[PDB]
Amino acid sequence: SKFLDRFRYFKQKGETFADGHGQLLNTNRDWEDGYRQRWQHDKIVRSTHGVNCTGSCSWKIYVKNGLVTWETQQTDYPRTRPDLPNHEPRGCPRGASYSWYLYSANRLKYPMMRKRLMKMWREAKALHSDPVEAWASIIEDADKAKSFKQARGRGGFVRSSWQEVNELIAASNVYTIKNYGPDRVAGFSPIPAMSMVSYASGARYLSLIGGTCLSFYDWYCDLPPASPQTWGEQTDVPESADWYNSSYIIAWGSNVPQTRTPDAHFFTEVRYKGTKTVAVTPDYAEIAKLCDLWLAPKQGTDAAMALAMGHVMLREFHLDNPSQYFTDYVRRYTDMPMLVMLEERDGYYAAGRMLRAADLVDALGQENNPEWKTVAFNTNGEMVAPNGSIGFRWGEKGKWNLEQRDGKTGEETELQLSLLGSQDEIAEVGFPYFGGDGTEHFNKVELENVLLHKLPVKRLQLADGSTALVTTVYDLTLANYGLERGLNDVNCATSYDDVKAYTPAWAEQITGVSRSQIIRIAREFADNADKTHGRSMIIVGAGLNHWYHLDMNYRGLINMLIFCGCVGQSGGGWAHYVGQEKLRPQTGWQPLAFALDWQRPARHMNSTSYFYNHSSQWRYETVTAEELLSPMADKSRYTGHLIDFNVRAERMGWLPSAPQLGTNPLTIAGEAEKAGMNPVDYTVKSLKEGSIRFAAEQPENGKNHPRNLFIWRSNLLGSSGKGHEFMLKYLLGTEHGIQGKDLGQQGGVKPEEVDWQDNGLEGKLDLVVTLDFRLSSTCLYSDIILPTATWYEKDDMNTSDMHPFIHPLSAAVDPAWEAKSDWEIYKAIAKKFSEVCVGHLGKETDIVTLPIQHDSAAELAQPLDVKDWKKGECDLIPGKTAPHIMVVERDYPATYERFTSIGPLMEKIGNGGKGIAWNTQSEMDLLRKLNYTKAEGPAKGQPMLNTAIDAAEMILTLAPETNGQVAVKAWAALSEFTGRDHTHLALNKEDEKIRFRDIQAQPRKIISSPTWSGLEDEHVSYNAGYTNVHELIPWRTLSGRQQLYQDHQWMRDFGESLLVYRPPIDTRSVKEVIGQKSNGNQEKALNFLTPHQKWGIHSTYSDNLLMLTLGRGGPVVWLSEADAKDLGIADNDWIEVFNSNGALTARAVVSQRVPAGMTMMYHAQERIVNLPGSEITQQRGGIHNSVTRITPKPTHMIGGYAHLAYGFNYYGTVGSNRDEFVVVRKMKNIDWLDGEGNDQVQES
Amino acid sequence: MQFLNMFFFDIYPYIAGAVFLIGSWLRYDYGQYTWRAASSQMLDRKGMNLASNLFHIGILGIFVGHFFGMLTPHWMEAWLPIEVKQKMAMFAGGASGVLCLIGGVLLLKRRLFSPRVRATTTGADILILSLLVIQCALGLLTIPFSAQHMDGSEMMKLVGWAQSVVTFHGGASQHLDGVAFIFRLHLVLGMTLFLLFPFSRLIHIWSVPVEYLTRKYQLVRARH
Amino acid sequence: MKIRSQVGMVLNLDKCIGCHTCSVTCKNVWTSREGVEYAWFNNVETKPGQGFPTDWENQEKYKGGWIRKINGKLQPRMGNRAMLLGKIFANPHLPGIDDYYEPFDFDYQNLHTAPEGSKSQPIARPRSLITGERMAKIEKGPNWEDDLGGEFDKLAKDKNFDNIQKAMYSQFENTFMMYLPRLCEHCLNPACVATCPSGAIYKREEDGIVLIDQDKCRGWRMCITGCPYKKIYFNWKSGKSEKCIFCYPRIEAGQPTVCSETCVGRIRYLGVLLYDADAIERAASTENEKDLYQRQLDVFLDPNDPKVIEQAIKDGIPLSVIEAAQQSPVYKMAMEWKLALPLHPEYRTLPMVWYVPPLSPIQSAADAGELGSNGILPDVESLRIPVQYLANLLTAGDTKPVLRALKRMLAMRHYKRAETVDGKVDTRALEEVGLTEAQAQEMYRYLAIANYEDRFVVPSSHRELAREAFPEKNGCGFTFGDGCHGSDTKFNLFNSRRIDAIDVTSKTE
């Protein structure tokens, strides 16, 4: 009795202590069980997060009372070497809050359908027993189609059932494929590395039926085009553990603590090892808190600082006191010794294409691909074609390596870098300079559009009898940087204080960063690299990569690292971190995701061009190609709208198309037969004649736009969708907030490759299907919402660039309510499709266009120039001057059986990637035992793909990163090309086989694979380029070395053969709308930056109450105190940000750490929480992408040129966005447009 | 009338008393987590300093007065005759009652109309406070009736009844013969508060922290 | 002399990345209930700032902690026993919900149920978790000032800017910010325990964790004012107060606290500290507040000293606890390397959660600078965070111990750089700060590599001692409601018996 216990008052008094200050009591403490019993749980399950953060962290999911209650990080990762800190616990605040979603008020529990669409669907089924015909009756009726499309984003969702939605979806897919083409059906899903099988689910279904799989890396602008340009690689970087091996690190435009949270400790801890760190950000970012020095250059001007730093490095470590390490490094690993041909101009010369073996008399002894082999002079003045050039990769074997040998005599040779001291004469070469251009918001330095430099040259007698002047990339580079070499060049610097194209003094004016800082740090960085042989590193992110001229920002940093021999050395190099793009078991996953085990090829598409076209953002383009050309380029050869360049790129096989042709590709085979010729020849003839045209030429004719779109693992319409209002208008057909006029309304120049119509086609998408576990902004605007399983309710796998571990997502409990995993959702759709298509689609023949692929022999397309077959400049040769034209047989009724089984092509053809292939029969035999086999039907005897685990095991068993047996066969395949053994890289792990159930027990480190350039070793950390530098494997570039010189016609004419400073572009989105809809408050133009947020990963977690409570309770925008005060804006005041593209509403965060002139709305707060109506559009306030618009860059459209050839997510136009400017002002009327009668008014 | 008289003044007082005691014991042994003052101050500090202090200082003055006024035996007699006690009760008790009533009304206005407090209140909090406000008002209303008998004849009856009840002497109701009805009501509502006591926040009264005044500052609990 | 043990905690602010993961995990586990939804046992604040609750460090306003009277005796700033009781009807210093923030939620369901024909896109508006009413706007949150969110003049009201000419810090080039994660200090002389009229708050003898007994607490809400760190939160629903429980359910078996194991930056260290309970009052009542830091160090005992070891055993400290104390990272950082410092020692509570001050980028200068004593690495004099600010936060205004900690961290860096870059031994910086190579290497092992087994050295609380673990192991958790838990006397009105006890006594002795 607690009451009776009170009588033991005195008896429970123990000894007093501290001279009567304290009393020890001997009383009951049973109440303590109250908190003990809260901590107690049923079990813990290992799982992770399928979100694009790059974290890839393994968590303990706690189940209590049979429900998911909370999570804490696993700490059992295999420990790193004793001299390196371990990875545990990893994690971040966003991930710690995921458990909130499972039973939250925003959880999607049942399949939903727009009421208007349901009403018509059911009324249609009552008149049409066949669902395909029911869908037709609705979609072919302008009034009916419009009734549900205009209802998008306007409420009315009603509970449906899996049976109903699956039938409608299947029916719509069949109708679309049958009447318009399989490529009129598409799916958008990104970053497969965060949940491999989940991505594969939809991609596999789409690929089987011929639908288009949209890209994401380029679309999100995570792809740094400078990587493919410089290394012929999409993106390969050192692991975070490798930062610990560096002795000098610069965090440039990378907010490590905030955007690389679980890895940040490697950065803070390496400082204790004596490593110096420098932060380069315009604002006082979180990263600055962790560094030794904070440099704050004007945003967007970073390339200027990088150029100045490189200037100092070359001057002091390459010229004045030549570094033995650096000199040797650039001699063997760069294209600097390579020879460049000079083009005759009026009074001077321009740098032309690189000299090729084919340009000389006996082609230098090279009979194979002589036009694809670069040339240089050896130390004995003799001309030679060194091993490693892209020409040695195909058509021959054993010479595609970086051994310093003569490609003809196979003898050892030493390449010479500079011609200075052996030149026949000195010639003046003009270099493009843009540092004088720019908007009023950035400082400029006036010099001359063309800077003439004195270059040492040599005259050569070409094979065609003509003569030519040549110089090395090395000399061209030193001149470009403005280094005086004794030739008395007026445009070269006499000192660092000399304001010349590229000095510290010059950069100080452009960036605002003190010249002494630029000098001191460049020197320290280079000195460190010299002492340690390359252990200087630069961690770079979207701060620099999301600008229109991201390539210049990157090549600037890249050159610094190359000049100091840091690329390929542990503790040094280019450390690019953006999205989670590294799906390690690549070649094991690719066949699964794109049904390559059954049919080849699939239909990949680069999304930036796709949306620029279909959401009609090109109809509002303000940027012209002309204003981007080099001042030394023939303007008349580059006329047309930016989209015209894309259309031309497409027909030349440079970039993919989608839809591909203006005619249903399933009908071409029939016509070919009647014409008495095979489909391929028939298509080519039709293309030449114009009877069949690329769909890109007429995107608004009514048959050339996508009609069915699947969206999963993405919030396209609330996060990544640049030009939000354009997507709503043109893709959705709903109200929109576009403020400006299009080309037609302004009477501007219409494209010369694309048809034009004053009133663009709207509401192009017939059906929008979104899969999610929370009702996102995208779901809000969809026709059908499918409840998917959370990451704690399904099995899958996850890997990342940050660490070498592969671990799983696991179902802690069966999916709640009626949710299903993505794999099961698409499997069910594939099943319904298979029955609904009977009588409509059978064994069809599909004509598929495929762009010239990088890492395939075809990459050696156009060697010396650009020829457009449509212009009659050359013949239409698919796979060389045009895209490959492939024939694909599809068994539509067998879609489900194929989806659920591993196809016969793995055994008939084999597997491979990155230019190599191998036999994988043993793996298929193993899979038959692990997954069991089909008992009968179309896939009888084939391994099964019933569950997500079966799919995961397929990935693990086929990939070299997860199966030592495959790893050895992969390295063996590569060895054939290089002539050097590389199997020693995996022999010691040949018995290793990672299994799904083992990684559930403990994450497993992967195996060194030729798919990558770093090693998974216990003595050396993973470092990109390590294999190129230490195994002498060439970078997949024209020269085989790190390419400083981009000699492709377009690269030269757009002024980017060499890195140069390029100021932020003028989007011209503000001046036409500012002051046009005044609310009485002052308006001001500001740079609109969208760095990634702290209270979410993109838009995921944005609606999570924990993140909203720790943040500011909803959409907010950061403003400097000066700008806010100028505008009369107080902290937390409602403000509106807008321009020609649209408008957004949010609350202000006023801070001193934001420099005047810029505003930051962290990336992705989306459109579902705490947003009042807009005073500009009179609609719900928009989002950050309501004020952005897609503007492509021609240099990102280049294809059919070695390293500049296509690859899904490897190359293509990017969704840059930091150059944007917006009008900002305090809101007056705060109307919520919800009928609650709870609106406010902000006075003054 | 005589039936109701014996019920309310001879029977009801023991029902209320039994419930009060066993209810308090049972809630203390089986409901420690529910044994709290239930402060609502943090949710709305406005006016609480004045209101709560007036109410508590006032009601404590009343308690002291009622306690010694009705329980103190007449023999404890020459210095404090009944009519002197009555004057003390009317003036000292009256003043305390006014303080109490003002505080109580302010607290009730707050509980009912302050959004944060009203939204988080329990029905019992409203009921118990409303009854206290009414009881205090009834109490003050007896003063003009006591004033009609400054010789203490009325008080003698009430004290007689109270002492009979607490000493378990039957026939307690007979002491009330002739007392003004107002006193009748006050007594019944007062006993009713004792009945409801264990099922309301009033249990906080049992916990007046007297021992704190002589307790060592630091407390440490040994393994147990 | 009475030795007691406690698992202390040290947070390395130099490695804190201000991510708040620690705050989210604690919330999910311990405070997601209605009544404490606004309470963050562990919360992270960006400095400069006023914090959560707003201006909690302003004791003149909140009256937290202890004061040393003229006669040398200690008294809660709140008032002595009688003064405190006099404030019980309405605590005049009590922080209001607005001082924290009004907890909110959003009407997500409107996104799902919005009717067909809506004139505008539906949205989820905020609603109060206190009243259930629509909120026109969210105006406050527990981390409202995150990353210098707010005008400098507002953030600079920060109590720690006292005695500092702060104008220069309002200039862009001189901008600075740091993170201050904090939980309950589980003090040796807790002001909360001393200010609770019911005596419901107590410090556990075996591990020093301070708890608020949920049975005994009467909701007097005086303790909230007493705590100078404002780490006790009133549960507005239950009517009782709650606070960080130092995750005792985990500590009891030797596991790290949730916020410790889940700290992404790997900045939290857990280790035993042996202290002389008999010296607590003497130390806390030292005349000069700048002596409190050292006075507390003097209360900590050397775990490797056989005199201490034998006394500990005599006083009942388990062998495994003494062993853990001998390899305590907390003892090394606070007593040996002098890197860790108390949080606001001037409150006189003898806090047990200490901090290593943060380094920062060098300050703005006229030029790029020159090589200093540490070469290309910073010298303590060049750091941009004003040392006086850090001293106001950790050492009662005395910059000496702060400078020593920062200098030593930098010295370690200098020494390690010579080793790993130049491949040479350079003890110059270490010698200047009084560190040996061995100490610098151990510092490096614990601070840089920081293996899990080195960050957390938590012994068992030995729940089997002085108790009956056998019957408890067999019957704990069957919460059928025997109504016999929580009291030592066996008699109970419902005529029941404890489920986890043995009632049939052995008759064979």
Ligand SMILES: Nc1nc2c(c(=O)[nH]1)N[C@@H](/C(S)=C(/S)[C@H](O)COP(=O)(O)OP(=O)(O)OC[C@H]1O[C@@H](n3cnc4c(=O)[nH]c(N)nc43)[C@H](O)[C@@H]1O)C=N2
């Ligand atoms: N918490 C969290 N983590 C995530 C994500 C998230 O949404 N939330 N998303 C992923 C993904 S997909 C990406 S692409 C990255 O996180 C982007 O982060 P990063 O730090 O590189 O970019 P960001 O665009 O934020 O830029 C980083 C900082 O650089 C500064 N900055 C901005 N503009 C510039 C500039 O022009 N020049 C320079 N030198 N710096 C500039 C700024 O401080 C910014 O925060 C990554 N992990």
Ligand code: SF4
């Ligand atoms: S969201 Fe990403 S970074 Fe955060 S805990 Fe999850 S996996 Fe790790």
Ligand code: SF4
């Ligand atoms: S988890 Fe660790 S690093 Fe992150 S805020 Fe908390 S204490 Fe700092």
Ligand code: F3S
């Ligand atoms: S004062 Fe004591 S009674 Fe409870 S509310 Fe605080 S622990």
Ligand SMILES: [Mo+6]
């Ligand atoms: Mo990204």
